[PDB]
Amino acid sequence: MNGENYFKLGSDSKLLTHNSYQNRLFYTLKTGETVADLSKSQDINLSTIWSLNKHLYSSESEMMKAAPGQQIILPLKKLPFEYSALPLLGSAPLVAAGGVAGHTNGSGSENLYFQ
């Protein structure tokens, strides 16, 4: 009679509610610490952080000038399978351009992408 012999899809020891917390972590900004400091500790690229929170803040400038009392969301996503059953097109509706992207860096420096 070995428990290992039989595998259970659900485990009492594991709580589903807690699992949801792992999906997204909320961190609060306190006086003395800067957004960049957070980025260093997490070993995450500032560009990535912006892409996620772009909906919360209008632009990167607002992030740089962040002050105490504001919140930052860190939502991590996992992709075990390279192929996705539900592919979404139009990730960036704000910009007409689509498909191939990233050929050039420092877009912010130029007001116009074309020039």
Side-chain angles (χ1 to χ4, degrees):
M1 298 188 72
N2 296 337
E4 297 183 349
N5 193 25
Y6 185 85
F7 185 85
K8 301 190 295 198
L9 302 176
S11 185
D12 296 330
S13 305
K14 186 176 68 172
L15 302 176
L16 302 176
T17 307
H18 287 76
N19 193 25
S20 68
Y21 183 85
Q22 300 301 315
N23 191 347
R24 295 185 303 185
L25 186 71
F26 296 95
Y27 191 89
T28 307
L29 293 171
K30 296 184 185 74
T31 178
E33 191 183 5
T34 63
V35 182
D37 296 330
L38 294 165
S39 188
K40 186 183 186 284
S41 188
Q42 303 301 310
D43 195 30
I44 303 173
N45 300 322
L46 299 175
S47 188
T48 306
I49 302 173
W50 181 76
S51 70
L52 302 175
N53 297 246
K54 68 185 192 192
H55 73 274
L56 302 176
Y57 298 99
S58 305
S59 70
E60 296 183 349
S61 188
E62 294 183 345
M63 295 187 73
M64 299 300 297
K65 296 184 185 196
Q70 295 183 278
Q71 296 177 342
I72 300 172
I73 304 173
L74 297 157
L76 303 176
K77 296 184 185 81
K78 296 184 185 172
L79 203 73
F81 297 95
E82 296 183 349
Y83 184 85
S84 185
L86 297 157
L88 186 71
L89 186 71
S91 305
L94 302 176
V95 184
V100 299
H103 297 290
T104 181
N105 298 327
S107 305
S109 69
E110 298 183 348
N111 193 25
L112 303 176
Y113 183 85
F114 294 95
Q115 296 176 342

